[PDB]
Write an enzyme that holds these catalytic residues in place. Structure first.
Site, short mmCIF file in Angstrom:
data_model
loop_
_atom_site.label_atom_id
_atom_site.label_comp_id
_atom_site.label_asym_id
_atom_site.label_seq_id
_atom_site.Cartn_x
_atom_site.Cartn_y
_atom_site.Cartn_z
N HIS A 83 0.87 -1.19 0.00
CA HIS A 83 0.00 0.00 0.00
C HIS A 83 0.89 1.21 0.00
O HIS A 83 2.11 1.11 -0.06
CB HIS A 83 -1.10 0.00 1.08
N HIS A 102 1.57 3.80 2.16
CA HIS A 102 2.18 4.45 3.32
C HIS A 102 3.69 4.25 3.33
O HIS A 102 4.25 3.35 2.69
CB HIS A 102 1.56 3.91 4.60
N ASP A 142 5.75 3.07 5.46
CA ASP A 142 6.26 1.77 5.90
C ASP A 142 6.26 0.73 4.75
O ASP A 142 6.76 -0.38 4.97
CB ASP A 142 5.55 1.24 7.15
N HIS A 169 -7.20 -1.67 6.06
CA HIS A 169 -6.31 -0.67 6.61
C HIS A 169 -6.20 0.53 5.68
O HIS A 169 -6.04 1.66 6.14
CB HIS A 169 -4.94 -1.34 6.85
N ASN A 192 -2.85 2.28 13.04
CA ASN A 192 -3.04 3.61 12.47
C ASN A 192 -4.14 3.52 11.44
O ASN A 192 -3.96 2.97 10.34
CB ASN A 192 -1.73 4.14 11.90
C1 LIG Z 1 3.44 5.03 8.26
C2 LIG Z 1 2.09 4.65 8.83
O1 LIG Z 1 1.20 5.77 8.57
C3 LIG Z 1 -0.16 5.46 8.54
O2 LIG Z 1 -0.57 4.34 8.74
C4 LIG Z 1 -1.09 6.63 8.27
C5 LIG Z 1 -0.28 7.95 7.96
C6 LIG Z 1 -1.20 9.15 7.76
N1 LIG Z 1 -0.53 10.39 7.40
C7 LIG Z 1 2.13 4.40 10.34
C8 LIG Z 1 2.71 5.29 11.23
C9 LIG Z 1 2.78 5.03 12.62
C10 LIG Z 1 2.20 3.88 13.17
C11 LIG Z 1 1.58 2.97 12.30
C12 LIG Z 1 0.84 1.77 12.51
C13 LIG Z 1 0.64 1.07 13.79
C14 LIG Z 1 0.79 -0.30 13.85
C15 LIG Z 1 0.59 -0.97 15.03
C16 LIG Z 1 0.19 -0.34 16.16
C17 LIG Z 1 -0.10 -1.13 17.45
S1 LIG Z 1 -1.91 -1.68 17.54
C18 LIG Z 1 -1.90 -2.60 18.95
O3 LIG Z 1 -2.77 -0.50 17.52
O4 LIG Z 1 -2.19 -2.67 16.38
C19 LIG Z 1 0.04 1.04 16.10
CL1 LIG Z 1 -0.39 1.94 17.50
C20 LIG Z 1 0.27 1.76 14.91
C21 LIG Z 1 0.45 1.36 11.23
C22 LIG Z 1 -0.46 0.25 10.85
O5 LIG Z 1 -1.44 0.01 11.62
O6 LIG Z 1 -0.33 -0.27 9.72
N2 LIG Z 1 0.88 2.22 10.30
C23 LIG Z 1 1.54 3.25 10.89
ZN LIG Z 2 -0.43 1.76 6.31
ZN LIG Z 3 1.38 -0.35 8.48
#
Ligand SMILES: C[C@H](OC(=O)CCCN)c1cccc2c(-c3ccc(CS(C)(=O)=O)c(Cl)c3)c(C(=O)O)[nH]c12
Ligand SMILES: [Zn+2]
Ligand SMILES: [Zn+2]
Length: 231
Positions: free
Chosen positions: A84, A86, A88, A149, A180
């Site tokens: 996708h 983003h 990451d 997602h 996120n």
């Molecule tokens: C780079 C990415 O940007 C976005 O997605 C939207 C950007 C909008 N401008 C991103 C940036 C920072 C964090 C993430 C996370 C993430 C993954 C796991 C957890 C733990 S849990 C228990 O909640 O599963 C959490 Cl807290 C977050 C994910 C994801 O979910 O893929 N992508 C993340």
């Molecule tokens: Zn993502």
């Molecule tokens: Zn992600």
């Protein structure tokens, strides 16, 4: 020899984990909005070459990924797919493209990456625009399950090993929230997960976009955490 967690990987280093014969995950860490997160990708052996799924979340991480691959595996990465738009998934595509890797994503991912100001894979993957679509790409199958997602998220299956790489549409078992969700469709996500479950009932290993691999339970768990988040 356990799967490596966020606190075990300094930002900038990359570790590989052998999932099955000819299948590795890659794990790296990155800072975002003042917190540190792990993320996964995939490496699949393609004869004497490698297919990469997803960057290591940033340019310097992705350079480090290529170095780790050279050290641990010693076969060239020739193609990469981003699942996708983003950072990451695509942050590091410019590093890949300067190291000789041909970079691919769906047209939906490419548009979204361009609009967001993220790095843009070179080549478009047609045949994935409707939910339930699947195409072959080297030693994997790419599958579009529907919006989850993100609206563009793809899933990758390695048929030789029954490995399902869910990407960010699939969460780890310890998760307590849906991660996120900025670009997510929480209402459609369970339906998309059900499509994955129906399409890949023989999956033996399921790898989330972030966190620990497990089995098929990750799919139901994901549906559960998303439904409770929507609420
Ligand atoms: C780079 C990415 O940007 C976005 O997605 C939207 C950007 C909008 N401008 C991103 C940036 C920072 C964090 C993430 C996370 C993430 C993954 C796991 C957890 C733990 S849990 C228990 O909640 O599963 C959490 Cl807290 C977050 C994910 C994801 O979910 O893929 N992508 C993340
Ligand atoms: Zn993502
Ligand atoms: Zn992600």
């Amino acid at each position: 020899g356990e799967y490596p967690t966020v606190n075990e990987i300094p930002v900038g280093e990359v570790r590989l984990y052998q999932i099955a014969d000819g299948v590795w995950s890659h794990i790296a860490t990155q800072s975002f909005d003042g917190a540190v997160y792990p993320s996964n990708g995939l490496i699949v052996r393609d004869g004497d070459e490698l297919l990469l799924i997803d960057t290591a979340w940033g340019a310097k991480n992705t350079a480090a990924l290529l170095a780790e691959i050279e050290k641990q595996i010693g076969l060239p990465v020739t193609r990469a797919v981003s699942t996708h738009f983003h950072d990451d998934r695509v942050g590091g595509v410019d590093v890949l493209r300067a190291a000789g890797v041909a970079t691919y994503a769906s047209p939906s991912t490419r548009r979204l990456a361009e609009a967001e100001g993220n790095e843009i894979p070179t080549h478009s993957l047609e045949g994935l625009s409707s939910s339930g679509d699947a195409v072959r790409f080297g030693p994997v199958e790419l599958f579009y399950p529907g919006a989850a997602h993100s609206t563009d998220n793809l899933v990758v299956y390695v048929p030789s090993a029954n490995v399902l790489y869910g990407g960010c549409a699939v969460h780890e078992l310890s998760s307590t929230s849906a991660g996120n969700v900025a670009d997510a469709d929480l209402a459609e996500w369970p339906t998309s997960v059900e499509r994955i479950q129906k399409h890949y009932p023989e999956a033996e290993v399921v790898i989330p976009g972030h966190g620990l691999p497990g089995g098929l339970d990750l799919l139901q768990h994901t549906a559960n955490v998303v439904k409770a988040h929507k609420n």
